Structure formats: C-alpha cells, structure tokens
Design a protein around this ligand. Structure first.
Ligand code: NA
Length: 319
C-alpha cells in the first residue's frame, strides 16, 4: 500500500484575510509547494462566468510555464491532479455535453501534464443537471483512453462525509466509478456537530468533538471501509482521511492533537483496514499566516508527512 499525503493548491491570488479566523493564505507557484506532499491538487476546474463547459487555465503562468512546473514536480516524484468543482463552480453538465467534457479533460491532461482528476463537487453540484451520470461516464472514457496508452489517469474524490450514505447523493459517483477510482479522500471538516451514532458507546460522535477526535476519525473511517452503519463501502486501500491544515483553512474539523490521527491510523491497521494516507485543505493554508501575522509554518506537512513516511517502504511516487 503506497502512501499518499494529498494537498490542494489554490489557482488564484489570495485576497488577504480569507481565513475563517481572519488569517491569510499564502501565494506561491505550484512547483513551490512544500516538500512532503506527494499528490498535489490544482484548484479548480470550473465553468467560467458566461461560458458553459468546465475548464482550467493557470492564473499566474503561461501554459508552457505551467506544463514545465508539472513536469518538474513529476520528475521529483509528485503527482499533480486537477480538482473539478470547489465553491461557486457552476458545474452543470448536460448529457449533450459529455463528449466535449471528455475532450476537454483530455486536452487539459495533455496540455499541462495532469496525472488525474479529483472530483470535488460543492453541495449544489452533486445532483445538478446530469452531473451524476455524465461525470462518471466521462471519467471512465478518459481513464480508458490513457489505459490504451499504458498510463494511469488517476481518479479521486473529495466528498463531504455526510453524503457518504449507502443510498445518498454521492453513491452514484462511487458505485459507477468502482474499479476506476484510485482513492477517495472525504472531507472530515466543515460539518459542525454532524458525525455518527456509535451504538457500542451509546454516543453521538461529532466532527467537532475534540475530546473524542480519535474515535471520530477511527469510527467514521471504520464504517466507510467496511460499508457498515448505513455508510457506503470504500476499500481501506483506496481511502484517505481529509483534514484542515489549520483553523483558518476550515470552520471546523481541525485536529488539535496529531496523536488522535496517529492512533486512529494505527487502530485501522490493527483492525486489518490499513488506509492509504491523509489529505489537506490546503498547501496554501499550511504556508499561510493567522490574523496576527504569525506563520502557520507548514505545521500540517511537518507533522503528518513523517507520520506517514518515516520507516514506510511504500511511498507513492509518480512513475
Ligand atoms: Na504528468
């Protein structure tokens, strides 16, 4: 099981004081992303104002420059995905648009050197238009195109965790991409008091319960990787826990005590359900500053990279 530490990179200039607590995300080139991250998700592919197909263009670079950044990252052993969606993405794919969507994903991959695509649909997008059928169908066609080439076009997804019920809104994306997706990194953040009911403890375990953070991480993940308690099944080897980099990056979900994660990962492995790694929103936040101008100073990557990678023989690397 090759381990991943996934981080999102913002394809925009920080507006300043963009954090949930008044902090400011950092601006830096994609290729300046902190070492440690081995999957980097360019954010976002979206439908621009007054256009009708989702697309992507680097905000700060020519296509040639941006392709060179990705080639450099790839040579360094890092995978770079394009993340489809995000907030206010206006993704409304009609069945009539499928071929064009497939061709645009191929164009982006071949133009820039993306190694795959992450499905990061906002709540409104999940059931919008024909998204639920077009996105999986298109992505299967893209994957098969590159398979004929001997290449693996990676598919990942970043579902908000409450949508991951067996017959929930997300089920079609997961069910219809079975055998095609490489891993799923759900967002264990921004859902406040939501969580899950634990019948053994007779307790509701929320995503904002700091005291029981370890049991929240362990218990939600265990349900997902076994497909129990009403949750959809995602194999543990294709599962990644998504966390906020800090309290500016997300309203809720920040893990105050990294030992909660360490212990949860170890308990998963001990139960025969070792998972693939961790994800964060976001590399720009991890390098950001709080409201007082103090640097977050890459604490997320400096903490979790050694956790996943020290003494680990199976470290995901591009090619
Ligand atoms: Na590439």
């Amino acid at each position: 099981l090759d381990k991943v530490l996934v981080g999102y990179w913002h394809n925009w200039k920080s507006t300043g004081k963009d954090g949930y607590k008044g902090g400011s995300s950092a601006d830096f080139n994609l290729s300046s992303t902190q070492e440690g991250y081995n999957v980097i998700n360019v954010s976002f592919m979206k439908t621009p104002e007054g256009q009708t197909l989702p697309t992507f263009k680097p905000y700060n670079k020519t296509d040639t420059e941006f392709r060179a950044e990705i080639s450099k990252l790839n040579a360094e052993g890092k995978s770079v995905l394009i993340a489809l969606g995000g907030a206010d993405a206006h993704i409304e794919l009609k069945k009539s648009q499928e071929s064009d969507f497939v061709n645009e994903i191929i164009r982006l991959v071949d133009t820039y050197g993306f190694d795959g695509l992450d499905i990061d649909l906002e709540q409104a997008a999940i059931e919008a238009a024909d998204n639920q059928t077009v996105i999986p169908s298109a992505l299967k066609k893209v994957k098969d195109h590159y398979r004929k080439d001997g290449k693996n076009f990676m598919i990942t997804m970043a579902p908000e965790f409450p949508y991951l019920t067996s017959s929930g809104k997300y089920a079609p994306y997961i069910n219809n991409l079975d055998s095609y997706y490489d891993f799923i990194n759900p967002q264990y953040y921004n859902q406040g008091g939501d969580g899950f009911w634990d019948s053994d403890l007779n307790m509701w375990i929320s995503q904002s319960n700091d005291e029981k953070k370890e049991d929240f991480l362990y218990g939600l993940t265990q349900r997902l990787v076994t497909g129990t308690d009403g949750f959809i099944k995602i194999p543990a080897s294709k599962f990644v826990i998504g966390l906020p980099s800090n309290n500016d990056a997300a309203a809720t979900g920040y893990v105050k005590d990294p030992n909660a994660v360490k212990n949860a990962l170890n308990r998963l492995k001990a139960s025969g359900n070792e998972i693939k790694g961790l994800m964060t929103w976001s590399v720009n936040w991890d390098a950001g500053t709080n409201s007082n101008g103090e640097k977050y100073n890459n604490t997320f990557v400096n903490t979790y990279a050694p956790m996943l990678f020290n003494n680990e023989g199976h470290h995901h690397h591009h090619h």
